[PDB]
Amino acid sequence: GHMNIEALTAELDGIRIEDNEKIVQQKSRDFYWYSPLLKRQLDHVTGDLVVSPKTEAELIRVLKACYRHEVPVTPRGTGTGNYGQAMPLSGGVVLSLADMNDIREIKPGWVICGPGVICSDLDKAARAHSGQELRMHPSTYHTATVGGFIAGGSGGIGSINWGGLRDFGNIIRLRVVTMEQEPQVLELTGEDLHKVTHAYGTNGIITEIEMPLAPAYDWIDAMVGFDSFDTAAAYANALARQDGILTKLVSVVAAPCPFDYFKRHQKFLKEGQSVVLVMVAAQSHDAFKAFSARSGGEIIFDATTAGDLKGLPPLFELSWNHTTLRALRVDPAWTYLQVLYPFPNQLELTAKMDRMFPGELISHLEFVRFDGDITCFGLPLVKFTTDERLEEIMDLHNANGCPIFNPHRYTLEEGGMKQTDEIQLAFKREADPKGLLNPGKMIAWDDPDYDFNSGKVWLFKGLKQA
């Protein structure tokens, strides 16, 4: 690489650039620091400038100039990923897509928009236009971009209904611009768009998204309280299996996390109580109450009876990695794991892991559709002591039937979600022959000897088969 930052800058007159060191540093970091390991390994990473195109034409200008002057390019939505995805390991350009945030079309069942649209802004527009909203969104709803969700996220609120970004149909089309001497526009549909999902921006810049839309309902927050984690998980699993009770969220958070760390909801909680977090559609809420009364589920908070309370976060901001946010805000020693508990043994497996790590781990489940089954993903909190103990806890999950997607890594393959196969490798050669797009994030690109055919359970399995 022969980086020439000065010549790059000269080629971008009319395009917004920022080179202030403090601002570049801030926009070179995400929420990697949720992992004590990443916090140490990536503490010294920073870019050289932030470039913020307003149009696809400006973006093409930027990529063309970066290819010519050999400046690395790391895409950034709003920098809320947890693994260092958007962090520029090699210096160079932080390519912000924040100003490519147009909403172009809203029709019955689908939307076309730019990558920088914030999830809640997209829903606000889809709701006003025709009472529609995203099928799923991360708990970073109000801050995260749709583009970064596709390229760096996996699922979240709404996965209970629709599965994950890993699944056919949850994305319709991705328009992607390559890093070639003449950047190419690709219109990826069918299976081809799934080369880009959760690829950390390593194989092209998403410049337009077509995604399905779902009906916007009056979603009712409710909490259900239990005296043990195992009875909370059994209730949550049963509720998730009620096919006529429409929910958007079914979470399990073990004591002592609710009472210790859900501070604004404390008056509804008590010491020793585990909680199930529920978002239930208004047309299903009476059925939800009747089911809960028949299933041992004491409703300790219900938005329909609590009144118009200000200062209460929505329950989804207590779920997914917002559960982690709340814990580490009070005690910074908390970190987390990412776990699958495979169907049909999720209740047995979550209980065994809960009992295996008393005190040191606090269980946290999110119920989701996964390959057509209802099961749960895990985001258990872990009290950090040493690097070695944290690796050991993950090793023991893997050895006890609970696949780990290691969040204490910053490469695609080590994170356990995006599998590298020959199709993934060939596509990056096509879309980034100089290796300028988010370098360092794909091990197989830097390692000719990499056994990318190893690993067991991949969340985003590769397209190659038979």
Ligand X SMILES: Cc1cc2nc3c(=O)[nH]c(=O)nc-3n(C[C@H](O)[C@H](O)[C@H](O)COP(=O)(O)OP(=O)(O)OC[C@H]3O[C@@H](n4cnc5c(N)ncnc54)[C@H](O)[C@@H]3O)c2cc1C
Q: Does 129 bind its own copies (CB under 8 A)?
A: no
Using CB under 8 A, which of 244, 307, 311, 448 touches its own copies? 244
Q: Does 141 bind ligand LUZ (CB under 6 A)?
A: no
Q: Does 97 bind ligand X (CB under 6 A)?
A: yes
Q: Does 201 bind ligand LUZ (CB under 6 A)?
A: no
**Closest Cα partner for 363 from 406, 408, 389, 393?**
393
Q: How far is the CB of 31 from ligand LUZ (least distance, A)?
A: 7
Torsion of CA 38, 27, 181, 190, to 10 degrees: 70
Q: Which is nearer to ligand X, 28 or 273 (CB)?
A: 28
Cα–Cα distance for residue pair 272/257, rounded to 1 Å: 9
Residue 241 contact partner, candidates ligand X, ligand LUZ, its own copies, none, CB within 5 to 8 A by sort of partner:
its own copies
**Closest Cα partner for 50 from 30, 70, 73?**
73
Q: Which residues participate in the annotated binding site for FAD?
A: 75, 77-81, 85, 139-140, 145, 154-155, 206
408: tokens are 């204490």
Q: Does 153 bind ligand LUZ (CB under 6 A)?
A: yes
Cα–Cα distance for residue pair 152/81, rounded to 1 Å: 7
**Closest Cα partner for 49 from 81, 15, 5?**
5
3-state class percentages of the chain: helix first, strand second, coil last, to nearest 5: 30, 25, 45
Q: Does 305 bind its own copies (CB under 8 A)?
A: no
Task: Write the burial class of residue 171 (CB in 10 Å: 0-12 exposed, 13-18 middle, 19+ buried).
Answer: buried
Using CB under 6 A, which of 81, 403, 440, 462 touches ligand LUZ? 81
Q: How far is the CB of 112 from its own copies (least distance, A)?
A: 11
Residue 75 contact partner, candidates ligand LUZ, its own copies, ligand X, none, CB within 5 to 8 A by sort of partner:
ligand X
Q: Does 88 bind ligand X (CB under 6 A)?
A: no
Q: What sign does the dihedral 135-138-142-148 (CA atoms) show?
A: negative
Q: Which is nearer to ligand X, 164 or 297 (CB)?
A: 164
Q: Does 420 bind ligand X (CB under 6 A)?
A: no
**Please, which of residues 246-265 interact with its own copies by CB under 8 A?**
246
Residue 145 contact partner, candidates ligand X, its own copies, ligand LUZ, none, CB within 5 to 8 A by sort of partner:
ligand X
DSSP-derived secondary structure letter, 136? -
Task: Write the burial class of residue 466 (CB in 10 Å: 0-12 exposed, 13-18 middle, 19+ buried).
Answer: exposed
Match 């829903």 to its residue by tokens. Answer: 123
Q: Does 422 bind its own copies (CB under 8 A)?
A: no
State which H helix or E strand residue 210 sits in.
strand 205-215
Residues that bind its own copies (CB under 8 A): 108-110, 130-132, 135, 161-163, 167-170, 172-173, 189-191, 212-218, 240-246, 281-284, 286-291, 293-294, 369-374, 465
The binding site for ligand X (CB under 6 A) comprises: 30-31, 74-82, 85-86, 97, 115, 138-140, 144-145, 147-149, 151-156, 200-201, 205-206, 320-322, 325, 438
